[PDB]
């Protein structure tokens, strides 16, 4: 009853151009079986949304990668939020929600905006830049480690560690194995900075530790929640901003609409998150036998959700393959949906908004003017190098 497919959604050929295979995955049926990895997959919007919003059956505490924590040791101690179910999930989630709250955004907005403006002006002086190293990576590196309250020393480990985290959600392919092998120095660096003495007062890290006073988290929980921010909080924004710039480079008409109304910056970023879906995939594990898409899935089965596919499903989206900065983007699943929906979404959107605002006000044209290279990661979609010429407004 369930179609079996041989598509490897973690192969380099798939990362290189996922969209035809994602259609094949959607059109095969509401639920497929991926023989390459012995997992179920859901690629249409409806089922992906349903699974995300059914946490008691499609759980996270057995891992949101391919590995089942009931069967194998996690490569690092489980995340107290990503890899937890309610009720255990709830108070750590509440702490990060408060640390990354609307109120907190007021404290960092001016500096985040100023750094974005300054960066775009700097790049305009250079003219021909790499929109990944010089913009998508450089801008988040210039604000987020500081906002965390990290010391200067060791920050070169941040992106490698994130690359590892996101590769490690994948199957045990070469990408994952190469990432985990000799990763100890990255792990040691991150784990050390999660300890309270190493985090600057006023920053997100210190604020997490401050919540141990309230009874919401214990002191021994705080370093793991700092670890969550150091795992998710940088590389995501790199690929989100890179996605947006790549979109604006490919859709000059939309750059021009953005220029004409910079207040479209926030939605132009949201649309980029839908369109590229920097976080492509997550898994759940069934806690019980369950019928999904007329398919009966046993207990303890891994279910692969194709977030990017869901965000391009023509059943849900008009012209899914068009980048439209005035699209009603609400309901996209690029930040997830339900109890685990991205708790750092205000930080992500703030960064994206203020960079796209700076571009909107300062740049007339973005032209790809060198070889484009894709960055391969089991979970993250994005580019390694994006040479562009920036024309000033
Ligand atoms: C464009 C940028 C980002 C994207 C696309 C993204 C994507 C996602 C997605 C899809 C989830 C849901 C996970 C699931 O359902 O299993 C999620 C959760 C999460 N994200 Fe974001 N994220 C981004 C930025 C950030 C930032 C900037 C931070 C921190 C400063 C962050 C921290 C987290 C954390 C801690 C969770 C787990 C929340 C929970 O389990 O309740 N992410 N993110
Ligand atoms: O808690 C964590 O360590 C964690 C790691 C990666 C993510 C991805 C979704 C952005 C989220 C949380
Ligand atoms: Cl670690």
């Amino acid at each position: 009853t369930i179609p079996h497919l041989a598509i490897d959604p973690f192969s380099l050929d798939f990362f290189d151009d996922p969209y035809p295979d994602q259609q094949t995955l959607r059109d095969a049926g509401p639920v497929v079986y991926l023989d390459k990895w012995n997992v179920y997959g859901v690629a249409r919007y409806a089922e992906v949304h349903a699974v995300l919003n059914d946490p008691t059956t499609f759980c996270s505490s057995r891992g949101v990668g391919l590995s089942d924590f009931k069967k194998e040791k996690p490569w690092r101690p489980p995340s107290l939020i990503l890899e937890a179910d309610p009720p255990a999930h709830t108070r750590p989630r509440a702490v990060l929600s408060k640390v990354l709250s609307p109120a907190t955004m007021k404290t960092i907005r001016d500096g985040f905006a100023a750094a974005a403006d300054a960066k775009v002006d700097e790049l305009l002086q250079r003219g021909c830049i790499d929109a990944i190293a010089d913009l998508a990576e450089a801008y988040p590196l210039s604000v987020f480690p500081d906002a965390m309250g990290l010391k200067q020393e060791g920050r070169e480990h941040l992106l490698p560690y994130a690359g590892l985290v996101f590769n490690a959600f994948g199957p045990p392919n070469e990408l994952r194995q190469t990432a985990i092998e000799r990763s100890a120095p990255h792990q040691a660096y991150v784990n050390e900075q999660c300890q309270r003495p190493n985090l600057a007062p006023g920053g997100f890290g210190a604020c997490i530790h401050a919540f141990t006073d309230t009874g919401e988290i214990t002191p021994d929980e705080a370093p793991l929640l700092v670890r969550s921010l150091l795992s998710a909080g940088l590389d995501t924004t790199v690929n989100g901003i890179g996605a947006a710039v790549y979109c604006l480079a490919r859709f000059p008409g939309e750059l021009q609409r953005l220029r004409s109304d910079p207040t479209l910056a926030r939605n132009a970023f949201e649309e980029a998150v839908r369109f590229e879906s920097p976080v492509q995939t997550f898994f759940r594990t069934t806690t019980r036998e369950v019928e999904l898409g007329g398919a009966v899935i046993g207990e303890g089965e891994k279910v692969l959700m194709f977030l990017g596919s869901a965000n391009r499903d023509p059943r849900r989206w008009s012209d899914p393959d068009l980048y439209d900065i005035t699209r009603k983007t609400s309901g996209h699943v690029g930040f997830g949906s339900g109890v685990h929906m991205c708790v750092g979404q205000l930080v992500a959107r703030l960064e994206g908004e203020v960079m796209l605002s700076a571009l909107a006000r300062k740049v007339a044209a973005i032209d790809i003017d060198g070889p484009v290279k894709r960055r391969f990661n089991n979970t993250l979609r994005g580019l390694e190098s994006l040479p562009v010429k920036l024309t000033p407004a």
Side-chain angles (χ1 to χ4, degrees):
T1 306
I2 298 162
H4 289 241
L5 291 86
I7 294 167
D8 182 1
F10 304 98
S11 62
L12 262 37
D13 269 13
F14 182 103
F15 298 143
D16 175 81
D17 179 18
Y19 300 111
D21 281 341
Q22 287 179 353
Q23 181 168 5
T24 305
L25 293 162
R26 288 189 302 268
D27 289 359
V31 181
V32 304
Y33 198 80
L34 303 174
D35 292 331
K36 179 61 167 232
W37 298 116
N38 271 294
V39 303
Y40 292 83
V42 290
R44 302 172 184 185
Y45 179 87
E47 287 73 28
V48 168
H49 187 271
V51 169
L52 289 167
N53 285 97
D54 188 9
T56 63
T57 290
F58 299 95
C59 84
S60 294
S61 60
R62 288 172 64 170
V64 293
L66 169 65
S67 185
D68 182 345
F69 292 176
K70 187 157 178 240
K71 301 185 166 159
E72 296 177 287
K73 196 151 193 186
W75 73 274
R76 63 178 186 165
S79 169
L80 302 182
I81 179 178
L82 186 69
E83 289 159 347
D85 301 316
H89 167 262
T90 307
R91 283 191 275 169
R93 167 73 186 212
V95 170
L96 291 188
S97 191
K98 292 176 193 176
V99 170
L100 305 177
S101 66
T104 300
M105 297 306 93
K106 179 100 178 182
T107 75
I108 55 171
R109 180 164 179 111
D110 189 76
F112 272 47
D117 280 19
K119 178 59 65 182
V120 174
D121 280 331
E122 175 188 9
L123 295 170
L124 280 170
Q125 300 318 295
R126 303 180 51 178
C128 295
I129 59 104
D130 183 338
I132 304 309
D134 301 322
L135 195 168
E137 288 177 349
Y139 167 67
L141 280 166
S142 80
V143 292
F144 181 76
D146 284 335
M148 285 296 307
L150 299 178
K151 64 181 65 165
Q152 290 300 144
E153 184 64 59
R155 291 184 181 186
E156 71 273 3
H157 290 282
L158 289 167
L159 285 167
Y161 181 83
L164 152 67
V165 170
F166 281 94
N167 272 323
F169 296 123
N173 57 16
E174 187 174 32
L175 279 171
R176 184 175 198 276
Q177 291 175 266
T178 295
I180 289 166
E181 197 176 87
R182 296 195 174 86
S183 63
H186 301 321
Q187 294 187 50
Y189 161 77
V190 163
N191 291 340
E192 180 60 29
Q193 306 325 303
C194 298
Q195 295 285 330
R196 191 174 199 164
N198 293 317
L199 296 157
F204 299 156
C207 184
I208 290 165
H209 282 271
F211 272 93
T212 65
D213 277 355
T214 73
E216 285 166 287
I217 49 167
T218 60
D220 68 286
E221 285 177 322
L224 284 175
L225 282 178
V226 179
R227 193 196 69 176
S228 288
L229 297 195
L230 297 180
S231 300
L234 185 68
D235 210 357
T236 52
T237 65
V238 170
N239 286 290
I241 289 172
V245 172
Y246 192 31
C247 289
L248 294 165
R250 288 178 288 171
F251 293 82
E254 295 303 280
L255 175 58
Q256 287 161 34
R257 303 165 79 204
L258 177 57
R259 290 176 63 197
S260 69
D261 190 349
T263 71
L264 295 170
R266 199 158 174 100
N267 207 60
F269 179 75
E270 201 73 12
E271 169 70 342
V273 169
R274 182 201 65 86
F275 185 86
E276 285 302 322
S277 295
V279 175
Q280 285 273 288
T281 47
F282 272 120
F283 300 78
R284 299 291 194 253
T285 316
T286 60
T287 66
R288 62 174 49 84
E289 177 182 276
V290 54
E291 175 277 312
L292 180 65
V296 181
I297 307 177
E299 183 274 345
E301 300 276 5
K302 283 283 172 169
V303 179
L304 181 50
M305 303 170 300
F306 291 89
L307 307 177
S309 181
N311 283 336
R312 284 167 174 263
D313 180 5
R315 297 161 186 82
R316 164 63 180 82
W317 309 96
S318 170
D319 295 324
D321 295 337
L322 298 189
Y323 177 72
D324 174 8
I325 72 178
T326 51
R327 185 185 301 274
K328 297 173 220 193
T329 54
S330 63
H332 79 82
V333 293
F335 288 119
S337 182
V339 302
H340 294 272
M341 184 179 175
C342 184
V343 70
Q345 63 190 245
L346 303 187
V347 174
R349 292 181 177 136
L350 168 63
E351 288 187 28
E353 178 195 346
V354 299
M355 175 57 68
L356 290 202
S357 176
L359 297 172
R361 285 177 282 109
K362 296 168 185 294
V363 172
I366 303 173
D367 298 298
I368 294 167
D369 75 331
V372 177
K373 304 196 290 154
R374 178 157 298 283
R375 182 171 286 166
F376 299 116
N377 186 277
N378 281 328
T379 301
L380 292 169
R381 168 163 170 92
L383 298 177
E384 167 64 27
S385 175
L386 175 52
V388 294
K389 178 179 94 153
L390 304 179
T391 299

